[PDB]
Design a protein around this ligand. Sequence first.
Ligand code: CL
Length: 158
Amino acid sequence: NSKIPIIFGLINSYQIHNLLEQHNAKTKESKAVFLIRDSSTYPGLLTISYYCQEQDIVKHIRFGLTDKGWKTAPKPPHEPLKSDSPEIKEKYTLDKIKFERKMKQFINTAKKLFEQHIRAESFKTLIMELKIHEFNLEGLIKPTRSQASQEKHFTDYV
Ligand SMILES: [Cl-]
């Protein structure tokens, strides 16, 4: 009963950076070190945060509960930039429409599953989706008790 979930609660971008640095993420391969948190943008999803060697930036990938367990969420379009050409802006408009449609359905489904205590295993499906995205599970950063998610769904994600 005293075990701490492996899922972070709400954590800010500054602490995400500093936790990745504490575990030497910037001198390891991308995804060799990562953490799993309650998403601050979409409640009921999870966000996997890691360091991207190729672009020297922290990157995030969202998962959500689906009928078969945790799966990768719809991919958001590339965030706009001051340098964006008309061609990039036009693709953004299309990708964003498609993303918002797909994400709305995905979130609505995830929320309904997240609200129920289902007597079927789901933690293993999170582990499996992490493997599908090639996350070094030995490199999982574990929260302290005060850092960990308070969500009832994650009590046994230990
Ligand atoms: Cl997020």
